[PDB]
Amino acid sequence: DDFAKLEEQFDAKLGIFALDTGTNRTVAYRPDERFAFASTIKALTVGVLLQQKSIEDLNQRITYTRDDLVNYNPITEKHVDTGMTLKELADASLRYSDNAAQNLILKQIGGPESLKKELRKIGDEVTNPERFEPELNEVNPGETQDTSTARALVTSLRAFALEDKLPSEKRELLIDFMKRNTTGDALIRAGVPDGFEVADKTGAASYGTRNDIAIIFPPKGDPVVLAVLSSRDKKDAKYDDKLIAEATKVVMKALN
């Protein structure tokens, strides 16, 4: 009723899945409803990048051009002449949601097809990487291109960040990046209690799609993996971060 209340208040659809890995308790609300995953895919993309490369390997310098810079490139646009290491690209992608960073990493790992193949390998049958940024944000209701579900994103994120799709040093790298995300302050972070660490990746796409996926680290006890996905009825709809923050609060109350 609380999630439905938020949907009502924000004229939005909520997609929620949370797993407290310390109790195996779950919170679900339209967990299997598809949403354009938007930039949350960047987290899973770095996960695959990390699976593919030694930590040292991430020091490879990637040269790119202005062709690669499409819309939102806060970091990559500044280093277009000097290039960026894969690590620096991962940093930009995760922490600034740098689209060109995501695209260059996605190319590095073998493209959307390779990302999808690696997600199927980990048993994510639902996430459908098809396109680069910002093209992947163009998802209509009912279309499955570049979509996933809260359950699938949580399950996949957990696999890379917490489970065994990455060795510990790489998991730590992925977690450190997401912990130091700069784009998520008003989302999942705005809905956790004090002293809870959040490692998150935000996204926003067409139809007022506004997403945040996270691993949340309580003061005591094991991490909670959470996806809060939202979409609205109208193509050019604006989103309200407050919905994600409020939905996160409901999750945390349920897990308490």
Swiss-Prot record:
Listed EC numbers: 3.5.2.6
Reactions listed under catalytic activity: a beta-lactam + H2O = a substituted beta-amino acid
PTM comment, free text: Large exopenicillinase is the primary secretion product; it can be converted to small exopenicillinase.
Membrane topology: Lipid-anchor
Domain of life: Bacteria
GO biological process: beta-lactam antibiotic catabolic process; response to antibiotic
Inducers of expression: By the bacillus licheniformis protein BlaR1.
Recorded GO MF terms: beta-lactamase activity
Record's subcellular location: Cell membrane
The keyword Membrane is assigned to this record: yes
Broadest EC class assigned to this enzyme: hydrolase
GO CC term, one of those recorded: plasma membrane
Additional remark text: The class A beta-lactamase family has a specific amino-acid numbering system, sometimes called Ambler or ABL numbering and often misspelt as Amber. A multiple sequence alignment was used to derive a consensus sequence and then the consensus was numbered taking into account insertions and deletions. This allows use of identical numbers, e.g. for active site residues, despite differences in protein length. UniProt always uses natural numbering of residues, hence there appear to be differences in numbering between this entry and some papers.
Similarity remark: Belongs to the class-A beta-lactamase family.
Stated name of the protein: Beta-lactamase
